[PDB]
């Protein structure tokens, strides 16, 4: 049978991205763990994302917001680049709010002061209004798993709001690759490197741990009832 328990190095940046290198794995096991984790990693980690927007004055994503230097589209996208942490562990829905000045440029940390909900990336360039500029926003945030386009859910908070594509998944990129390493005479033993990029929110390492737990959990369903 043979081959000792491998060593698991982790090297991290501290919010987004960390490398994970469990070393001598027998020929094959590299992928055998690597890929399923990636699947789980990109697919089934719980997060939160903007899911619907209401803009005071104007329906349609394809409209004209006046006084706004940008336009609805860049906002929707801008919004998708926003991350918010739900401190309140029971809640599964929140609405955010915005009130906009004249000559000013709105950051994401210019939202509704609201406690209980934690804006993770206070910067972020949301919008920008001109002299005599008016923007009010009602942005819905939702708990979730993958990437869920609007054309699926169709969240309608109002009868005027436009619904956005949901990227509720703190992992933004998973890239893994198994190369060969050597123990003694054996030069072709698996060495799997896991590279996890998450939005500063859930750490890569946490991501990984969660991901493992999901697969293990699931693997216990293969218990005869």
């Amino acid at each position: 049978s043979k081959l000792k328990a491998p060593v698991f190095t982790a090297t991290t940046q501290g919010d987004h991205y960390g490398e994970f290198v469990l070393e001598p794995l027998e020929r094959g096991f590299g992928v055998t763990l690597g890929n399923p984790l990636r699947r789980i990693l990109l697919s089934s980690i719980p997060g939160t994302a903007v899911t619907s927007v209401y803009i005071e004055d104007v329906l349609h994503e394809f409209s004209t917001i006046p006084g706004v230097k940008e336009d609805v589209v860049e906002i929707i996208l801008n919004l998708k680049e926003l991350v918010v942490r739900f401190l309140d562990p029971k809640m599964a829905s929140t609405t955010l709010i915005l009130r906009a000045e004249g000559p000013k440029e709105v950051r994401a940390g210019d939202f509704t002061p609201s406690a209980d909900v934690e804006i993770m990336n206070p910067d972020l360039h949301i919008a920008t209004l001109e002299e005599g500029g008016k923007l009010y926003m009602e942005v819905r945030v939702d708990r979730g798993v993958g990437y869920v386009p609007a054309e699926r859910h169709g969240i309608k908070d109002r009868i005027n709001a436009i619904p956005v594509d949901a990227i509720f998944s703190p992992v933004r990129r998973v890239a893994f690759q198994v190369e060969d390493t050597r123990l003694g005479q054996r030069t072709d033993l698996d060495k799997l490197t896991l590279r996890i990029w998450t939005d500063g929110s859930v750490t890569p390492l946490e991501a990984l741990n969660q991901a493992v737990a999901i697969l293990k959990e699931h693997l216990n369903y293969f218990a005869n009832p």
């Binding site: 190369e179 060969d180 050597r182 123990l183 003694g184 005479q185 030069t187 072709d188």
Partner: protein
């Protein structure tokens, strides 16, 4: 044999042939690294018919670290008919060749062979790794064009 795995500056080298190619160097290393009281006794345990002890592979490996070899195919027609590489300790008995280096060697994986050589003196190493390392000779000396271009399969993917 094709070695897609390697980086541009790396090599085949079956363990057997590395070991031997490099033998004398290993003998001094074996001594340097304990097991092997003298270099003459290092010679000895490398002979006992077959079956090689892990420590020695580990030694060999250290021996090699950053030395390069010369590979060479068939009709050596221009300088790129020799290229330097860092040897990788590899399974099996075929030498493994980076796919990007093929063109210059006009190597084709249907029965080609290549010889390999070990530059001994530090000069000759230096010589190989500065001047003849596969990865410092990226462009044709005949028409200053890239010779290490993506190709026959890499293109397809891209």
């Amino acid at each position: 044999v094709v070695g897609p795995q390697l980086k541009l500056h790396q090599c085949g080298l079956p363990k057997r042939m590395a070991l031997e190619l490099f033998k004398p160097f290993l003998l001094k290393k074996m001594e340097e690294k304990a097991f092997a009281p003298n270099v003459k006794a290092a010679r000895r345990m490398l002979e006992r018919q077959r079956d090689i002890k892990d420590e020695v592979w580990d030694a060999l490996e250290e021996v090699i670290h950053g030395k390069v070899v010369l590979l060479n195919r068939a009709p050596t027609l221009h300088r790129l008919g020799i290229q330097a590489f860092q040897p990788v300790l590899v399974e099996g008995q075929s030498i493994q060749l980076h796919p990007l280096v093929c063109e210059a060697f006009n190597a084709d994986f249907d029965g080609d062979q290549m010889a390999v050589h070990v530059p001994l003196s530090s000069f000759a190493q230096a010589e190989a790794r500065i001047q003849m390392l596969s990865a410092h000779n990226l462009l044709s000396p005949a028409s200053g064009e890239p010779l290490a271009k993506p190709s026959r399969d890499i293109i397809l993917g891209l």
